[PDB]
From Swiss-Prot, chain A:
NCBIfam families per UniProt: PRK04016.1 (NF003089)
GO biological process: regulation of transcription by RNA polymerase I; transcription by RNA polymerase I; transcription by RNA polymerase II; tRNA transcription by RNA polymerase III
HAMAP family reported for this sequence: RNApol_arch_Rpo10
Top-rank taxon, per record: Eukaryota
GO cellular component, one term: RNA polymerase I complex
Cleaved signal peptide residues: none
Name of the gene: POLR2L
Keyword flag Zinc: yes
Keyword Zinc listed: yes
Listed Pfam families: RNA_pol_N
Principal place of residence: nucleus
Species annotation: Homo sapiens (Human)
Oligomer and partners: Component of the RNA polymerase I (Pol I), RNA polymerase II (Pol II) and RNA polymerase III (Pol III) complexes consisting of at least 13, 12 and 17 subunits, respectively. Pol I complex consists of a ten-subunit catalytic core composed of POLR1A/RPA1, POLR1B/RPA2, POLR1C/RPAC1, POLR1D/RPAC2, POLR1H/RPA12, POLR2E/RPABC1, POLR2F/RPABC2, POLR2H/RPABC3, POLR2K/RPABC4 and POLR2L/RPABC5; a mobile stalk subunit POLR1F/RPA43 protruding from the core and additional subunits homologous to general transcription factors POLR1E/RPA49 and POLR1G/RPA34.
Protein name per the record: DNA-directed RNA polymerases I, II, and III subunit RPABC5
UniProtKB/Swiss-Prot annotation, chain C:
Subcellular location: Nucleus; Nucleus, Nucleolus; Cytoplasm, Cytosol
InterPro entries: DNA-dir_RNA_pol_30-40kDasu_CS, DNA-dir_RNA_pol_insert, DNA-dir_RNA_pol_RpoA/D/Rpb3, RBP11-like, RNAP_Rpo3/Rpb3/RPAC1, RNAPI/III_AC40, RNApol_insert_sf, Rpo3/RPB3_RNA_Pol_subunit
Species this protein is from: Homo sapiens
SMART domains, per database record: RPOLD
Secretion signal span: none
Database matches in Pfam families: RNA_pol_A_bac (PF01000), RNA_pol_L (PF01193)
GO-annotated molecular function: DNA binding; DNA-directed RNA polymerase activity; protein dimerization activity
Entry keyword set: Acetylation, Cytoplasm, Disease variant, DNA-directed RNA polymerase, Leukodystrophy, Nucleus, Phosphoprotein, Transcription
Subunit structure: Component of the RNA polymerase I and RNA polymerase III complexes consisting of at least 13 and 17 subunits, respectively. Pol I complex consists of a ten-subunit catalytic core composed of POLR1A/RPA1, POLR1B/RPA2, POLR1C/RPAC1, POLR1D/RPAC2, POLR1H/RPA12, POLR2E/RPABC1, POLR2F/RPABC2, POLR2H/RPABC3, POLR2K/RPABC4 and POLR2L/RPABC5; a mobile stalk subunit POLR1F/RPA43 protruding from the core and additional subunits homologous to general transcription factors POLR1E/RPA49 and POLR1G/RPA34.
Name of the featured protein: DNA-directed RNA polymerases I and III subunit RPAC1
Assigned GO CC terms: cytoplasm; cytosol; fibrillar center; nucleoplasm; nucleus; RNA polymerase I complex; RNA polymerase III complex
Lineage: Eukaryota, Metazoa, Chordata, Craniata, Vertebrata
From Swiss-Prot, chain E:
Summary of subunit composition and partner proteins: Component of the RNA polymerase III (Pol III) (Pol III) complex consisting of 17 subunits: a ten-subunit catalytic core composed of POLR3A/RPC1, POLR3B/RPC2, POLR1C/RPAC1, POLR1D/RPAC2, POLR3K/RPC10, POLR2E/RPABC1, POLR2F/RPABC2, POLR2H/RPABC3, POLR2K/RPABC4 and POLR2L/RPABC5; a mobile stalk composed of two subunits POLR3H/RPC8 and CRCP/RPC9, protruding from the core and functioning primarily in transcription initiation; and additional subunits homologous to general transcription factors of the RNA polymerase II machinery, POLR3C/RPC3-POLR3F/RPC6-POLR3G/RPC7 heterotrimer required for transcription initiation and POLR3D/RPC4-POLR3E/RPC5 heterodimer involved in both transcription initiation and termination.
Homology family: Belongs to the RNA polymerase beta' chain family.
Tissue spec: Expressed in the brain, in the cortex and the white matter (at protein level).
Annotated S-S bridges: none
Domain of life according to the entry: Eukaryota
Official protein name in the record: DNA-directed RNA polymerase III subunit RPC1
UniProt subcellular location: Nucleus; Cytoplasm, Cytosol
From Swiss-Prot, chain F:
Gene3D superfamilies in UniProt: Nucleic acid-binding proteins
Gene Ontology molecular function terms on file: DNA-directed RNA polymerase activity; single-stranded DNA binding
Family recorded in the similarity comment: Belongs to the eukaryotic RPB8 RNA polymerase subunit family.
InterPro entries noted in UniProt: NA-bd_OB-fold, RPABC3
Self-association and partners: Component of the RNA polymerase I (Pol I), RNA polymerase II (Pol II) and RNA polymerase III (Pol III) complexes consisting of at least 13, 12 and 17 subunits, respectively. Pol I complex consists of a ten-subunit catalytic core composed of POLR1A/RPA1, POLR1B/RPA2, POLR1C/RPAC1, POLR1D/RPAC2, POLR1H/RPA12, POLR2E/RPABC1, POLR2F/RPABC2, POLR2H/RPABC3, POLR2K/RPABC4 and POLR2L/RPABC5; a mobile stalk subunit POLR1F/RPA43 protruding from the core and additional subunits homologous to general transcription factors POLR1E/RPA49 and POLR1G/RPA34.
Gene behind the chain: POLR2H
Matches recorded under Pfam families: RNA_pol_Rpb8 (PF03870)
Compartments it resides in: Nucleus; Nucleus, Nucleolus
Keywords: Acetylation, DNA-binding, DNA-directed RNA polymerase, Nucleus, Transcription
UniProt organism field: Homo sapiens
Protein name (record): DNA-directed RNA polymerases I, II, and III subunit RPABC3
Region (Non-specific ssDNA binding): 16-40
Modified residues (N-acetylalanine): A2
C-alpha cells in the first residue's frame, strides 16, 4: 500500500524517493532515467519503485 | 515397523527410502572424475562422519591421493567416508553403456572404498539390487544402512551449496 | 595457479583458497604477521558521505567474508524495537507503521549505550532514546482555489520523518541532544493523512544486533568483488580494438592507435561488472583470459546514515577482535 | 571467561587429545570459518572441521583433530591468538590509511 | 565374501577337488538343517549343483588362464566357501515365513495399489 | 617407500579429452617401450606435449620425488583373455596389462597401494 522504506534484498532506504518521481515524471524523463538521477544502481530499488502501486492516494480518496 | 518397514517392502521388493533429488546430483558431482578437492575440504566431510549425534568417532583421513607438485583429494573417497565400525561392500551396473567408456557404470565398490564409477538413481537411490541398502542391509545387517544414508544426507547436499 | 581465479565460459575454476601448509608442494606460509603484515595494505577509494570503498591486499577469503558478515548483521546500531500507541487514528496501522518506524534509521552513536535487560518499561534508564511523533492533518483553511492538489488543500498531508520530535529522559538531555539525535532522513513517507486524522506515538529505541531483526543493519553494500585482472595473449592489434572495447565494460580497455595497430591493452581492469560477452565472439575468446585475482578483495561499504562508513568498518573489525579473544582464556 | 562455551569432548580419545570438538556456543560462520582458517594453517592439525550441526546457527562444533601427539587446546589458542594479531594489525594498517 | 579376504591359500592342488571336499563339508553342515523345514532340502541339491558349476568354472579358469601372481591366486579358498555356505544357510533360513508371518494383507495391497 | 619393482621408459598413443571436463582428466594410452605393455593412465594433464606426452619412466612402487599419484585402497584383478589389473585411484584408473616377466607388487587389496612417476630424465 505504501512504499517499502528498504529494498527487501538490498538495504537501501527508499520511502524518501516517491515524492521526487512524481516531480521527476513531469520533468518527463523516461522512468528508467528518473531512477538514475536518484541513486538506484541495482535491481532492487528499481523493483521497489517501478513495481509499486500507491494505493495510498486512491484508498484515502474515501477514507472516512 | 520402525527399522524394517522403511527400507524393505514386500509389495515390490524395492527400497522406498532413497536420495529423493539433489542428494543424487550432489553425490554424483562428488563422484565425477573431474572434482579434485583440498585437505582444506575436510570441511564438508565433517557434517557426515565428524558430525551430529551418534557419529563422532574420528575419521581415518583417506590418504593424500596425489603427491604431485599439487597434492589433491579425488572426489570419490570423499564420498566413501566413515571411520567407525568398518565394513565391506560391492556394486556394479550403473546407468551408462559398456566397452572403459568414460565410465559411468559398473561402479565396482569394494570394501567401503569407491574403485570406479559415478552414482545414479540406480546406484544411490530406489533401485533394485545395487544400492546403499542391498549391499548395506544384507551384509552388513541393519543399523548400518540407516546410518550411511544420514552421512549422505549431510555430506552431499551441503556440497552443492559450495558449487551451485 | 595459487590465487589466480579463472572464468571459463561454463564455470569458475580455482576457487577454494587452496594454500594451507600441507596442501601444496610449493611452500605454504605457516601464516602470520611477518609475511602477512608486509604484504598487507589498505588502499582507499572515494571515502565519501555514506559510501566508502577500499582495496585490502593480502587477506584470504575467510577473514574478508568475516568482515562482510559482521558489517551486515553482527554489528549493533540504534534503531527502534518498540512503539507505544496513543490515538492512532490513521489509516493502515499498528504493524506496518510500527514496522515502518522500526525501519527508520535514528542517528545516535551505538557506542554510548548498552543492551536492555528486563526493566521498568522493559527498561527506561540508559537505552531508551524516546521519540515523540505528533502529526495532525487538517484542511488548509485558505484555499479559494478550490479543488486543487492535496499539497494545497491539506496541512502536513503526509508524515515525514521530520515530525519525529525527541523526548528527553533526564539521562541524555545534556550530552547528545544538541541536534545530533534526529533521524538521518527528514523525508520518509511514513503514512499519508487526510483531514480529521492524527497520530501520536512513543518510540522505544533499544539497542540490538543485526541477527535479531535486520532493521539493525547500518550497512547496505556489504557484498563485493575480488578484482579482475583480464589478460591478453599476442593481441588482436588493429580494428579488433572496437570489439575488445565494446565486449568489456566501457572504460576497461583503451583503443589507442591504428598505424601502431595496438588494441590498447588494459586501461582500468576494475570497472567491469563482468557482462562477459567475450566468449560469444567465438574468434576472440581464445585470446583474452579472464582472471579475478585472490589478493585484492576490493570492498565498498555504504551506511544508512547511522554512522560514517569508517566508523562501521572499524566497529566490525573490532567486534571480530572481541569475538576472537572472548574464547581465548 | 569461556566456562559455558568451550565444551570439549575427548571421551574415547584414540590419541590422548583426538576427538576434541570445541562446541563453540552462541556462534556463527563469521568467527567460525576465520578460526577454522587460522587453525587449519598450522602443520600439526589435520581437521579444522568447522561444521554447524544444528539447524539454528549457534553451536559450531569445530572438531579439530591434531596429528595425535599434541593436545588440541594448543592449536585452538594458537589460532585464536593468531587471528587476534591478524585483525589488530589489519586495523592498524587500515585506520592509518583513512589519512589518504 | 570377495570383500573380506582370508589371504592364506594358493593354487597348488587344483583346488577344484578341494572345492569338492568343501562341498562334502557342506553336505554335512546343512543336514543338521532341520527345524521348521521343507525350505532347505528342496533347494539343497540345487545349492550343490551351483557350487559344482562354480568349481567347474574355477577349473576352466585355473587350466586355461594359468596355461607369477598365481593368476591373482584365483582367490577361492576353503575359508571363503565355508563362509559362503554359512551365509547361504543364514539367508535361506531367515527368509523363512511361517512361523510368523502375516502374508495376507501384504498380497492384497500388492495386487491392489 | 619403494618395493616397486617397475623400472620403465614410455611413450604414448592417443588422448581422449572429450571425456572429462577436466582436460587434466584424460585417458593416456601408453604402451611399454620396455617390452610392450600398455597403461591406461588418467593423468592430471599439464605438461605432456607429444600426442599424449613425454617420458613416463613409471616406477610403480609401494630421487627428487617428482613422482606423484598414490591411492591407498581397493583393486580388481582379472586374468584377461594376458593377466591384467585395474589400479584405481578412486577416480584415476590404470589398467596394467602384461606378463609375469615383470616383478611383484600385487595383492587383491594391494595393487592400489601404488606410487607413480613422471620425468626426471
Amino acid at each position: 500500500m505504501i512504499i517499502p522504506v528498504r529494498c527487501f534484498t538490498c538495504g537501501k532506504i527508499v520511502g524518501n524517493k516517491w515524492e521526487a518521481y512524481l516531480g521527476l515524471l513531469q520533468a518527463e524523463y523516461t522512468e528508467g532515467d528518473a531512477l538514475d538521477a536518484l541513486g538506484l544502481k541495482r535491481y532492487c530499488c528499481r523493483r521497489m519503485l517501478l513495481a509499486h502501486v500507491d494505493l495510498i492516494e486512491k484508498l484515502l480518496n474515501y477514507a472516512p | 515397523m520402525g527399522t524394517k518397514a522403511n527400507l524393505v517392502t514386500p509389495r515390490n521388493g524395492e527400497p522406498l527410502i532413497a536420495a529423493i533429488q539433489d542428494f543424487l546430483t550432489g553425490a554424483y558431482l562428488l563422484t565425477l572424475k573431474d572434482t579434485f578437492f583440498d585437505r582444506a575440504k575436510a570441511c564438508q566431510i565433517i557434517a557426515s562422519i565428524l558430525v551430529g549425534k551418534d557419529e563422532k568417532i574420528k575419521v581415518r583421513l583417506p590418504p593424500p591421493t596425489i603427491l604431485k607438485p599439487v597434492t589433491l583429494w579425488t572426489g570419490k573417497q570423499i564420498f566413501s567416508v566413515i571411520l567407525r565400525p568398518s565394513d565391506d561392500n560391492p556394486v556394479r551396473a550403473n546407468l551408462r553403456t559398456k566397452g572403459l567408456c568414460a565410465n559411468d557404470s559398473y561402479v565396482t565398490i569394494q570394501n567401503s572404498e569407491l574403485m570406479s564409477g559415478s552414482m545414479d538413481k540406480g546406484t544411490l537411490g530406489s533401485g533394485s539390487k545395487n544400492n546403499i541398502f542391498y549391499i548395506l542391509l544384507r551384509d552388513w545387517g541393519q543399523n548400518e544402512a540407516a546410518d550411511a544414508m544420514s552421512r549422505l544426507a549431510r555430506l552431499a547436499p551441503v556440497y552443492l551449496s559450495n558449487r551451485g | 595457479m595459487r590465487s589466480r581465479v579463472v572464468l571459463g565460459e561454463f564455470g569458475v575454476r580455482n576457487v577454494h583458497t587452496t594454500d594451507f601448509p600441507g596442501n601444496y608442494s610449493g611452500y605454504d606460509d605457516a601464516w602470520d604477521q611477518d609475511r602477512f603484515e608486509k604484504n598487507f595494505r589498505v588502499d582507499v577509494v572515494h571515502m565519501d558521505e555514506n559510501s566508502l570503498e577500499f582495496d585490502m591486499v593480502g587477506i584470504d577469503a575467510a577473514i574478508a567474508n568475516a568482515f562482510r558478515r559482521i558489517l551486515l548483521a553482527e554489528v549493533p546500531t540504534m534503531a527502534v524495537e518498540k512503539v507505544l500507541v496513543y490515538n492512532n487514528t490513521s489509516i493502515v496501522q499498528d504493524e506496518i507503521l510500527a514496522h515502518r518506524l522500526g525501519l527508520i534509521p535514528i542517528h545516535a552513536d551505538p557506542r554510548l549505550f548498552e543492551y536492555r535487560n528486563q526493566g521498568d518499561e522493559e527498561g527506561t534508564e540508559i537505552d531508551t532514546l524516546q521519540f515523540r511523533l505528533q502529526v495532525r492533518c487538517t484542511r488548509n483553511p485558505h484555499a479559494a482555489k478550490d479543488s486543487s492538489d492535496p499539497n494545497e488543500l491539506y496541512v502536513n498531508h503526509k508524515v515525514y520523518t521530520r515530525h519525529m520530535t525527541w523526548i528527553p529522559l533526564g539521562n541524555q538531555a545534556d550530552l547528545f541532544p544538541e541536534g545530533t539525535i534526529r533521524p538521518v532522513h527528514d523525508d520518509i513517507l511514513i503514512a499519508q493523512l487526510r483531514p480529521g486524522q492524527e497520530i501520536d506515538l512513543l518510540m522505544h529505541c533499544v539497542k540490538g544486533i543485526g541477527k535479531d531483526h535486520a532493521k539493525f543493519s547500518p550497512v547496505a553494500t556489504a557484498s563485493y568483488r575480488l578484482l579482475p585482472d583480464i589478460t591478453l595473449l599476442e593481441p588482436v592489434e588493429g580494428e579488433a580494438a572496437e570489439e575488445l572495447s565494446r565486449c568489456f565494460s566501457p572504460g576497461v580497455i583503451e583503443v589507442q592507435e591504428v598505424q601502431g595497430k595496438k588494441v590498447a591493452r588494459v586501461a582500468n581492469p576494475r570497472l567491469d561488472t563482468f557482462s562477459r560477452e567475450i566468449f560469444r565472439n567465438e574468434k576472440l575468446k581464445k585470446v583474452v583470459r579472464l582472471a579475478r585475482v585472490r589478493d585484492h578483495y576490493i570492498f565498498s561499504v555504504e551506511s544508512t546514515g547511522v554512522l560514517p562508513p569508517d566508523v562501521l568498518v572499524s566497529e566490525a573489525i573490532k567486534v571480530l577482535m572481541g569475538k576472537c579473544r572472548r574464547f581465548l582464556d | 571467561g569461556e566456562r559455558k562455551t568451550a565444551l570439549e569432548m575427548v571421551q574415547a580419545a584414540g590419541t590422548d587429545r583426538h576427538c576434541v570438538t570445541f562446541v563453540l556456543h552462541e556462534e556463527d560462520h563469521t568467527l567460525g570459518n576465520s578460526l577454522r582458517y587460522m587453525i587449519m594453517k598450522n602443520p600439526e592439525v589435520e581437521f579444522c572441521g568447522y561444521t554447524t550441526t544444528h539447524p539454528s546457527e549457534s553451536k559450531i562444533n569445530l572438531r579439530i583433530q591434531t596429528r595425535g601427539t599434541l593436545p588440541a587446546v594448543e592449536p585452538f589458542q594458537r589460532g585464536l591468538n593468531e587471528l587476534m594479531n591478524v585483525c589488530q594489525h589489519v586495523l592498524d594498517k587500515f585506520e592509518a590509511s583513512i589519512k589518504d | 565374501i570377495k570383500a573380506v579376504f582370508p589371504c592364506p591359500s594358493e593354487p597348488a592342488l587344483s583346488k577344484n577337488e578341494l572345492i569338492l571336499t568343501t562341498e562334502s563339508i557342506m553336505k554335512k553342515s546343512e543336514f543338521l538343517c532341520c527345524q521348521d523345514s521343507f525350505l532347505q532340502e528342496i533347494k539343497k541339491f540345487i545349492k550343490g549343483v551351483s557350487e559344482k558349476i562354480k568349481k567347474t568354472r574355477d577349473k576352466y579358469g585355473i587350466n586355461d588362464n594359468g596355461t607369477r601372481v598365481l593368476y591373482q591366486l584365483d582367490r577361492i579358498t576353503p575359508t571363503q566357501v565355508e563362509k559362503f555356505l554359512e551365509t547361504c544357510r543364514d539367508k535361506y533360513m531367515r527368509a523363512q515365513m511361517e512361523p510368523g508371518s502375516a502374508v495376507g494383507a501384504l498380497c492384497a495391497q500388492s495386487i491392489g495399489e | 617407500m619403494a618395493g616397486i619393482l617397475f623400472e620403465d621408459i614410455f611413450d604414448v598413443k592417443d588422448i581422449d579429452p572429450e571425456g572429462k571436463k577436466f582436460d587434466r582428466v584424460s585417458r593416456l594410452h601408453c604402451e611399454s617401450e620396455s617390452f610392450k605393455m600398455d597403461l591406461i593412465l588418467d593423468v592430471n594433464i599439464q605438461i605432456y606435449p607429444v600426442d599424449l606426452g613425454d617420458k613416463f619412466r613409471l616406477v610403480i612402487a609401494s630421487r627428487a620425488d617428482q613422482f606423484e599419484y598414490v591411492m591407498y585402497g581397493k583393486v580388481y584383478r582379472i586374468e584377461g583373455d594376458r593377466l591384467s589389473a585395474y589400479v584405481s585411484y578412486g577416480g584415476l584408473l590404470m589398467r596394467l596389462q602384461g606378463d609375469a616377466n615383470n616383478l611383484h607388487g600385487f595383492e587383491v587389496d594391494s595393487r592400489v597401494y601404488l606410487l607413480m612417476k613422471k620425468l626426471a630424465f
